[PDB]
Design a binder for this molecule. Sequence first.
Ligand SMILES: [Mg+2]
Ligand SMILES: [Mg+2]
Ligand SMILES: [Mg+2]
Ligand SMILES: [Mg+2]
Ligand SMILES: [Mg+2]
Ligand SMILES: [Mg+2]
Ligand SMILES: [Mg+2]
Ligand SMILES: [Mg+2]
Ligand SMILES: [Mg+2]
Ligand SMILES: [Mg+2]
Ligand SMILES: [Mg+2]
Ligand SMILES: [Mg+2]
Ligand SMILES: [Mg+2]
Ligand SMILES: [Mg+2]
Ligand SMILES: [Mg+2]
Ligand SMILES: [Mg+2]
Ligand SMILES: [Mg+2]
Ligand SMILES: [Mg+2]
Ligand SMILES: [Zn+2]
Lengths: 153, 308, 108, 292, 148, 166, 37
Amino acid sequence: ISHGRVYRRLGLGPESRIHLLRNLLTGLVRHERIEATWARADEMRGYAEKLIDYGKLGDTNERAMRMADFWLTEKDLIPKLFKVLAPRFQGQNGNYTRMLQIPNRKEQDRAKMAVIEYKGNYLPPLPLPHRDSNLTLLNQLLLGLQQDLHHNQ
Amino acid sequence: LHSKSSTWWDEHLSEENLSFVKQLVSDENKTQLTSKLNPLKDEPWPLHPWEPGSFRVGLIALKLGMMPLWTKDGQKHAVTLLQVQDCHVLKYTPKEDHNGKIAALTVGGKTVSRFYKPDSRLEFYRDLGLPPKQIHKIFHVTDNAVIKPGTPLYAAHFRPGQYVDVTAKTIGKGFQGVMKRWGFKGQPASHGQTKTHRRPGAISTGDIARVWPGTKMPGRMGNQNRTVYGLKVWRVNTKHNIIYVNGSVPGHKNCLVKIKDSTLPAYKDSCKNLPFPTYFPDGDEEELPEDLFDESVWQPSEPSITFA
Amino acid sequence: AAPKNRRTIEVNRCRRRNPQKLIKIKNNIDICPECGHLKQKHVLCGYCYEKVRQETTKIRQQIGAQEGGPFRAPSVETMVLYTGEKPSEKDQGKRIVERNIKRPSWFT
Amino acid sequence: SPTELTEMRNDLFNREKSRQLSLTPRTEKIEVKHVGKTDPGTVFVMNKNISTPYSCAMHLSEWYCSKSILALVDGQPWDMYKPLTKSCEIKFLTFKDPDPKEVNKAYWRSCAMMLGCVIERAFKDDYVVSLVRAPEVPVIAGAFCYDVTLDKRLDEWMPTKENLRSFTKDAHALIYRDLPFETLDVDARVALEIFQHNKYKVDFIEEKASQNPERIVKLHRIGDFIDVSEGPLIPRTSVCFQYEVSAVHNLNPSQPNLIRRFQGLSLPTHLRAQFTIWDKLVERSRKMVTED
Amino acid sequence: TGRGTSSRFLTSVLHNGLGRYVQQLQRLSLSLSRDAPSSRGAREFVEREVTDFARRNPGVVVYVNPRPCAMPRIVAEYLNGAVREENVNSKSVEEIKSLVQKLADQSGLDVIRIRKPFHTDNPSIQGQWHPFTNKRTALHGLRPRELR
Amino acid sequence: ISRKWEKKNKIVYPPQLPGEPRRPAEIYHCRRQIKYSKDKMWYLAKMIRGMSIDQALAQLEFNDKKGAQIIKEVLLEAQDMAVRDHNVEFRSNLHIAESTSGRGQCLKRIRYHGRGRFGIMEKVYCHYFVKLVEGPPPPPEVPKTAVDHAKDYIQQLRSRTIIHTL
Amino acid sequence: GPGETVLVAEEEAARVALRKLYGFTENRRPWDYSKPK
RNA sequence: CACCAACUUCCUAAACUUAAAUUGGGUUAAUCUAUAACUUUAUAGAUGCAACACUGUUAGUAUGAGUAACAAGAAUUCCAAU
Ligand SMILES: [Mg+2]
Ligand SMILES: [Mg+2]
Ligand SMILES: [Mg+2]
Ligand SMILES: [Mg+2]
Ligand SMILES: [Mg+2]
Ligand SMILES: [Mg+2]
Ligand SMILES: [Mg+2]
Ligand SMILES: [Mg+2]
Ligand SMILES: [Mg+2]
Ligand SMILES: [Mg+2]
Ligand SMILES: [Mg+2]
Ligand SMILES: [Mg+2]
Ligand SMILES: [Mg+2]
Ligand SMILES: [Mg+2]
Ligand SMILES: [Mg+2]
Ligand SMILES: [Mg+2]
Ligand SMILES: [Mg+2]
Ligand SMILES: [Mg+2]
Ligand SMILES: [Zn+2]
């Protein structure tokens, strides 16, 4: 009976879970694109989004600095969070991270894998799933339906 | 591959048409629902008077939550909130074709999406002219109380002072041991017990050389249909179609429940003073107040209760 | 508790060939438009993804040389330029990573 | 008798096939190069006038065979089952290409032809049904249109809902058969002989023959049924999955000969539509279509 | 062994006796050793009894093949195509004569369980029983409870 | 040990006469000493039975089992020798007629236990066999209709004879 | 004649008549092989 | 006012009259030798001369069971790197 609980049980315990997640978050901020097991990447996605919000609060905020200090073990990253990532995501209200499933791991444990990144990074674009064009057969028929309904009141 | 492939509604939709389809489906839901708002002006089936031994149709409601309620005597009653959402009669079976003793009506509530449903269910609703509903339930209704399919049902069907029966699936607790499932005592924690603390004791006696059918054993608990009998109705909110029911109702919040007049012998014939087929807002002989109260209930905004 | 009897191959064949124990056939396998290799509908193409990361490793390798040591992450945005490209006015005051190869067609 | 026309027309169709098949003696090898994005640079050493683009797809893999609806031979759309004629570069088109304009037309034309086949055999042999034309309508129109002239006896009978439902049942039967769309490029003379009785077809053949410098005219056959075509068609009738004959509308200025336009919608297996979406499209396919 | 073996019905090769009786045995082969103790009885059969058997059965062709041999063997072939082989190794003259006669009397039909001791293609002369035999008809063919 | 599966690719039939259906090509291939249980390999071999070459490869590419890659590699080798050596025209025109696993020669080792006791463990090997037949996969299985079931029942009734009598 | 359906039964009865008209009834006198003459 | 029911008895063909230690007797599988036979046989002479069973010996292979159980901190720019 684990109804309503919003966390995975990871690592050696609750504290170990935080540290495992913290290490992934630290890697994500530095490199902006990280591969982990799909479950662990999903666990860390929420923290990645909330960290940007703390960065938006501002450099001078004391709580933001303490939060940034705890989560970014490599302390050179803290300037990056407040002066690079937060300015980038000023317009958005959320959805800063992009997470997609990668083919399973070829390492005899066949782990389910994911790629987690921050949006807007400098790295080569991921091969995202592109929806079909309006020129396809089904789309054109729907486009015809849309035009008639809009034009005819 | 010349082989079967899996598809979903969004697979071949472009970004532009992806929003268009959602608006198109949402628009049709509104049109169909409005078309059914006026039943009396749509060739209603003949209206019959109430007579002893009659059974009306029931409703399907969503379980909102609980709150405290006080009566003019100062006693506090925990009450559960039941909301009727898109309750409509769907199908009618005559007395002969369902059960010789009584007829049946199918009533559905809680409009749901049309995208991940079997075509058979979608075909059923298309002829009926309604959007699909999450749950169907069957109500035994006497012939005089039969209602035409497609007729909207509202919370004002019930009235305060009326006792009612609620049935729903209980909260699902998964596989459980005998201590939690059947209230077994278990074994002592200390004094030398070797790996026996929450276990069943002896299954049976040795003479029969078998285990009796129905023996209580560890297994999946909850997620079963259960009924609660004789819950009073304290108040009805017409604007939002909320029924206030005494006590607890099986299931979790946001779960659909089946509500029908109580079958207890004491409340044998309560339909005498209730809308006999159902309550029709279309008639609007007198527009109902936003909130209907039971006499004992102490309404908010009243003066403080002094036991004078 | 120990077995009272040997289990026959007739019983055993019914256990290990029951449909519940068989490998399910997958209906979500599709061919990738760009590379023409196989993929699952809900999963990224492994061939195309393989191209992206190996280019990423090349970029990150160049980054390591420029920084030269740990704890040298910039406080300004980064940008990658390929041979035949020069920083624009909007590119002013941003770390520039230089790659010997030409701009990949897919990378823009 | 109508059965005789099917026999004689089929005989002429087969005779031309053998004549062209015999026309090519021995085996001559043509090099055709794959120019598509995937598997680039592959060269297929095929036999001239015998091998077809489907055979090239067979070499690569079953995905090409199942997903390829059309081929681009030297920049021109070719039927998958039309024998290749000379050395060229070949590319395979699918329904999910970024701009599948040519594929959409071929699917639309083939579905219209399937409508004509159903109409001919639907009515009782007592009445006389004559196929006039299949107007070329944009896919945006919302339906494919086939024009037909029924007997003067039925000059004021209109099909009911059950009658239209009956038509779709025949169409679905055609799909289940999984009949390949045979292809012939034939000179006016033979095409006129196959379609001598039908005045409407004769004039259409004359137009489509004058258009080309020679008298070549495209002929396509589904089972026994034969028809003239505006261009390339789908490989097989099994491509269609959802099919509907939406409605028939009488063309008002048709006092000399009452022409009734037949309308319907279809979608391939590759692009299936959900239940509700299909219904809404079908409703919009029951409205008149004006060729533009 | 009945359920571990095949069975058949009683039969004759070509309605053997309806018009005329035909002997099914058509060929007998006897292989001998000129000088071998085990073939002695077979040698005496050839000297004394083979000629008489052939005359009595003029439709059977009898082949006698003296040759260096370890075991004398009799091979019998029938008109239906069946072939039966018998080891005659060190049998007396009488046993061989007794066995040879059995081959002549037999047909080539397989010697296995026979389901029924009787076979007929015309089991009935007055009509095979069916449930309506011995049931009286009703006026106007009215079934029970039928009002008419 | 026996190695008859390899020999089957050496059978040579006489030239077919003009009035005869074209004989489909058959290719036999195997990989012998695979470090993998035959019981485990059966499931992978079972799944691809009857499928086309491309369909079999697609399913194997996305299976997580160790044996899937082994079977896929064998299938690709079988495909190449079919076209290269056995006059198969189209690579795609192939289906799995036979696919099964057999026991290999195993090694005996010692499994240590708690109190100086031991057990005999087996280091298991297995073989994998395939036959590829040119042509489309044979049509799938069609269940009996209700009318077919009724027809068989009536035949049983009509076969009844009067038992143990003239 | 007997039959599973009325049409089948009637058709069988037609054959029963024709057998009794051409003297080929199932109980007809057996063929005579006795004669040496 | 009977019928059915056991190889009891009769009948066609035959047969000549009943737990188990023990006792009398007629054959026979296998192999070697003598002398023969020559697709595997005969008469004599011999013997390590016949195994559904000793918690039998050795080897092989099952069952339990693909079960119990076993193992590598994280990311990356990479295993004598950070
Ligand atoms: Mg959970
Ligand atoms: Mg309470
Ligand atoms: Mg639960
Ligand atoms: Mg306790
Ligand atoms: Mg304890
Ligand atoms: Mg008992
Ligand atoms: Mg150990
Ligand atoms: Mg073992
Ligand atoms: Mg006796
Ligand atoms: Mg011994
Ligand atoms: Mg033994
Ligand atoms: Mg024991
Ligand atoms: Mg033993
Ligand atoms: Mg085992
Ligand atoms: Mg177990
Ligand atoms: Mg377990
Ligand atoms: Mg375990
Ligand atoms: Mg460890
Ligand atoms: Zn790809």
